[PDB]
Structures are given as C-alpha cells and as structure tokens.
Symmetry: D2
Subunit: 120 residues, 4 copies
Amino acid sequence: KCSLTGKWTNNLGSIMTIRAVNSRGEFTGTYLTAVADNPGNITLSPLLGIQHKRASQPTFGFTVHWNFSESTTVFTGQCFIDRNGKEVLKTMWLLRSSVNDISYDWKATRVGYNNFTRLS
Amino acid sequence: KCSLTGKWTNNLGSIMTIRAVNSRGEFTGTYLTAVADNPGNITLSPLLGIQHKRASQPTFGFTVHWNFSESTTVFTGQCFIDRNGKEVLKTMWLLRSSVNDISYDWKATRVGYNNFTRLS
Amino acid sequence: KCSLTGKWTNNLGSIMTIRAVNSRGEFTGTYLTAVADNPGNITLSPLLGIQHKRASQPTFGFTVHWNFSESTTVFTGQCFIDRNGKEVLKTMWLLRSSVNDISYDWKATRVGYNNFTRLS
Amino acid sequence: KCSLTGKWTNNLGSIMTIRAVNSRGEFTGTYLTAVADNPGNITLSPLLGIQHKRASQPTFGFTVHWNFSESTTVFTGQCFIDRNGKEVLKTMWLLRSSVNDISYDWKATRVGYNNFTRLS
Ligand SMILES: O=C(O)CCCC[C@@H]1SC[C@@H]2NC(=O)N[C@@H]21
Ligand SMILES: O=C(O)CCCC[C@@H]1SC[C@@H]2NC(=O)N[C@@H]21
Ligand SMILES: O=C(O)CCCC[C@@H]1SC[C@@H]2NC(=O)N[C@@H]21
Ligand SMILES: O=C(O)CCCC[C@@H]1SC[C@@H]2NC(=O)N[C@@H]21
Ligand SMILES: *[C@@H]1O[C@H](CO)[C@@H](O)[C@H](O)[C@H]1NC(C)=O
Ligand SMILES: *[C@@H]1O[C@H](CO)[C@@H](O)[C@H](O)[C@H]1NC(C)=O
Ligand SMILES: *[C@@H]1O[C@H](CO)[C@@H](O)[C@H](O)[C@H]1NC(C)=O
Ligand SMILES: *[C@@H]1O[C@H](CO)[C@@H](O)[C@H](O)[C@H]1NC(C)=O
Ligand SMILES: *[C@@H]1O[C@H](CO)[C@@H](O)[C@H](O)[C@H]1NC(C)=O
Ligand SMILES: *[C@@H]1O[C@H](CO)[C@@H](O)[C@H](O)[C@H]1NC(C)=O
Ligand SMILES: *[C@@H]1O[C@H](CO)[C@@H](O)[C@H](O)[C@H]1NC(C)=O
Ligand SMILES: *[C@@H]1O[C@H](CO)[C@@H](O)[C@H](O)[C@H]1NC(C)=O
C-alpha cells in the first residue's frame, strides 16, 4: 500500500508534508516550493486533497493555496510502488494566475510535471 | 465579491454544489458529471478545495474523488464578476487515470476546460 | 468531408488562413492573434501543420512561429461537421515561452483551448 | 547555437530524426515512438515543425502525424545548451485522439512531457 502521509521532495527541490489521510481519503498538508514567480516571497503554504483509499497504487489530487501570491496550483497523479517497495509520486499540475478580468483569461494557466520521492 | 458557495453547472451539463467556504478558504462539495469514460456508472462524487478569501475575483482549486472509478480530476481557475454581478468560473482541469504500472504513466493524464455559471 | 483550407476565426478573435493541403496532409498558413503578452507588437505569423487526409472528421496539429516574440505555440484538435455541413475546429494549445536557462523551464508552458469557425 | 537537425532519443525511448532546418526555421523529420495505445501497430511517422532561427536556445514546435492511428501529437519546447556544450530538448506535448462526434470532445486530449538528448 501507498499512503500519501509523510514528507516528500520533488525534482525541483520543493518539499511537501502530508498529514493523516482520513477514511474518505481526504488529507491536509503543507508545501514549500523551491521556485516561484517571485522566489523572494516564498512562504510555507497549505494544501488540501483526496486520494483513493483502497487502491494499492492510488490516484489522488490536491490544491495548494499559495500564501504569498494570488495564484493556486493543483496537482494530480498516481503513487507507484517498485519491486523493492520504493514509492514514487508521478504528477502533473496546473498553476492558475490571477488576472484582472476575463479578457486575459487565456494566459492564466501554466502546466507542468513533478516526480516526488519520500524524504524518509 | 465572487463566492463559490452554491450550485453551478458547466458547458457539458455537469452540476456541482459547493458548501460553506471557511475562513481559510477551504470548501467541500459534490459533483455530478454529465460525462465519463463509463457514463452508465456515474454517481455523485465528493470534492474538496481551497479558494483565496480576500480577492474579489479569487483563484481556486479543487479535487474530485470520483466514487465510481479509480480516476481523480483536479480543477483550477478564477471566479469573475461582470458589471451586472453575474459570476462565471473559468477553469481548466487534469483528469488522472489509474494505470497498472509506471511504464504506462505517459498516457494517464487528460486535460480540458470548463466554464461554470450558477444554477438557480 | 471536413477540410482545413480557408479562413477561420476563434473565440478570442484571432484569424487564421490555411492554404492548400497536399496529399500528405501538410499545410502552411498565417495566423493573426487578437491577443499576446505584448499586444502592441503583434504581427502576422506563419504556421505549418499536418492533418489526416482520409478521415471525414480529421485530427490535425500545427505550429505557429510568432514573428514578434521568442515564443512558439502548437495547436492540436479535430474538425467536426454537423448535419448542416457546418465545420468547427475544437483545439487545445501549448504556448512555450523562451526562458534564460534550464532552471526556469518549469514556468515556460501555458495551456488553453480555442474553437474555430470559418470566416466568410 | 542549438540546431534541431540530427537524431534524438527521449526518456521513453522514442527516436526522432530532424532533417535540414531552412532559412525560415522550418523542418521535416521522422518519429519512432517506443509507446502507443496499440504498440503492436507502431510504424515510423512523419513530423513537420518550426523553430526560431536566430536564438541561441530557440523555442520550437512540431506536429507528428501518426501513420498507424487517427491521432496527432504536437510537441513544443526549448533547446538548452550546458556549460559543456551538451544539448537537451525540454518539451511538453498534447496528444489528440479521434472521437466520433463533438459530444466526446472533452475526453480527446492527453498531455505530458519529454526530454530529448542527441543520439550522436
Ligand atoms: O509562483 C507562485 O506564485 C506560486 C508558486 C508556484 C510553484 C510551482 S507549482 C508547480 C511547480 N512545482 C513546484 O514544486 N513548484 C512549482
Ligand atoms: O470518467 C471518469 O472516470 C470520471 C469522470 C470524469 C469527468 C470529467 S472531469 C473533466 C470533465 N468536466 C466534467 O464536468 N466532466 C468531465
Ligand atoms: O504572446 C506571444 O508571445 C505570442 C502570441 C500568443 C497567442 C496565443 S496562442 C494561444 C491563444 N490563442 C490565440 O488565438 N492567441 C493566443
Ligand atoms: O498511441 C498513438 O495512437 C500514437 C502514438 C503516441 C505516442 C506518444 S506522443 C507523446 C509521448 N511521447 C512519445 O515519445 N510517445 C508518446
Ligand atoms: C525524478 O525522476 C528522475 C528520473 O527518474 C530521477 O532521476 C530523480 O531522482 C527523481 N526526483 C525525485 C525527487 O524523485
Ligand atoms: C512579492 O515580490 C514582489 C517583487 O519583489 C514584491 O513587490 C511584493 O510585495 C511581494 N509580495 C508578497 C506577498 O510578498
Ligand atoms: C459557457 O460559455 C459559453 C461561451 O461563452 C456560453 O455560451 C455558456 O452560456 C456557458 N455555459 C455554462 C453552462 O456556463
Ligand atoms: C463501470 O462500467 C464498466 C463497464 O460497463 C463495468 O464493467 C464496471 O463494473 C463499472 N464500474 C464501477 C465501479 O461502476
Ligand atoms: C466558439 O464556441 C462558442 C460556444 O459554443 C460559440 O458561442 C462561438 O460561436 C464559437 N466561436 C467561434 C469564433 O467559433
Ligand atoms: C514588444 O514589446 C515590448 C514591450 O513594449 C518592446 O520593448 C519590444 O521591443 C517588443 N518586441 C518586439 C520584437 O516586437
Ligand atoms: C531525461 O532527464 C533525466 C533527468 O535529468 C535524465 O536522467 C535522462 O537521462 C534524460 N533522458 C534523455 C533521453 O535525455
Ligand atoms: C491496431 O491495433 C488494433 C488492435 O490490435 C488492430 O485491430 C488494428 O487493426 C490496428 N490498426 C492499425 C492501423 O495497425
């Protein structure tokens, strides 16, 4: 089994902590990004998500509410286990910027990927 | 002020209901999709997300844990208000499928958009 | 049969003109975007793409080499025809910005959608 | 400088050849994917794209017309050079499937990433 609970780092150097996953697969956590539009502003930021509970290699999603900008990121992915019991989170994300009005909506969404492994 | 609490529909005919947004911008809800890989299986499914609280046109994200498949979707976007006080959510999404192992990860993520307006 | 040759506009007000499609499904064209990072710089820009030839509702892709910035956009989608012979292109796109070095790669890709209908 | 001309492999094991880039940045090539929806059907497939010509680390895009399915993929990205002169293509892609009619359009687009390095 592949619980999200724990500490994780990604390929950019970001650090994420996921707390207890409840019986509905819901979880809270924190996220310290290594990169940002204005990296001097970075602070620890909250996340909230849901994973599938029963699956051995569950899919999941979470939202990061950045505390230092008007942006939001969502991540979705799957937790995989090796033959050796090593876990990897393979994810993709959408990063939504705040724009002034609906005419700028077209430019407000960035896309990318991240792989996470456990810190311990 | 552009608020998420209430009932919404999107351009595909899906319905979502978001409950009270707390002081941290967190919300729960339910999502009834009009479409699926197997539309005969569709059931009402829970969501969990976060919005920015203070912005008049906030960005937000949420995760939908589909109750009828192993997939997960995340939505992110922004709530816009026009002259008349009419609200629209402009969103993009990632839909993560469950695959058997990490060698299939490349095909596991679909992307799309949705616009939502209030229902009743 | 759903063909790409001709003039089109999308939901943002951009105009594109596609020339003759050859026997391999290749086409050239021009693209006039209604929006940009710096809309004061916009100029008419070339495109190059490929469609499937034999399908009645073909999928296709094309690249737009913006003549006024260091960015590139790719569009992919499908041409649909309804009962009346009315054609619509449903597309998604990736807009790649130029960044200074590989450490900024994570922020370099925006995503979005466009629907196109014929002009004249 | 970072010409696309040459042979490249990606992180999935796919092989791509890009032929001469003309004075407008346009190029043809071939692509042998290591993976597919139906990998038993895979055959060598054509691509067509454009890169920026003058930039030392150009952005670019290309379209792959798959010869063995009704799908199309577009790739966009940037060519980066190391301090040692080693080139890497960092890309993202959209893979468009053919669907029967417009009501299924929502499910027709997959997204992902690939990094390429030179074969020689
Ligand atoms: O720049 C901002 O306003 C908020 C921080 C965004 C950080 C993004 S989220 C996707 C990518 N993966 C990370 O670990 N960090 C970046
Ligand atoms: O097919 C599944 O396994 C779960 C349902 C997926 C529904 C998607 S989520 C994105 C798009 N927007 C909708 O309202 N429904 C579809
Ligand atoms: O801003 C730039 O540097 C180049 C212009 C980008 C225009 C984008 S491409 C996607 C979207 N669809 C359009 O018709 N225009 C925008
Ligand atoms: O499955 C198909 O019908 C066509 C082949 C798709 C292969 C995709 S394109 C994106 C990804 N990167 C690759 O090198 N191959 C896959
Ligand atoms: C991400 O994956 C790459 C390629 O497998 C690997 O080299 C790297 O260690 C991974 N990063 C993390 C934090 O897991
Ligand atoms: C973020 O960075 C910008 C540019 O330095 C600064 O002016 C702004 O006040 C910062 N905002 C926050 C929330 O830290
Ligand atoms: C979505 O936007 C379209 C295009 O503007 C509009 O016609 C429609 O009313 C919107 N649909 C919903 C359900 O909000
Ligand atoms: C969904 O649909 C498939 C195909 O009809 C069916 O076999 C399966 O049992 C259904 N799964 C669930 C959990 O609803
Ligand atoms: C795009 O689709 C919308 C929503 O159906 C429609 O109202 C509009 O006519 C289309 N726009 C263009 C320019 O094709
Ligand atoms: C585009 O706009 C910027 C900002 O106004 C300007 O400085 C620059 O010269 C322009 N670039 C080109 C090549 O059009
Ligand atoms: C892709 O990048 C990863 C991480 O840097 C690297 O280990 C791998 O060798 C690269 N693959 C190719 C084909 O360049
Ligand atoms: C692709 O694979 C399927 C499933 O094996 C097969 O039935 C079909 O004929 C193949 N199509 C092509 C174009 O090779």
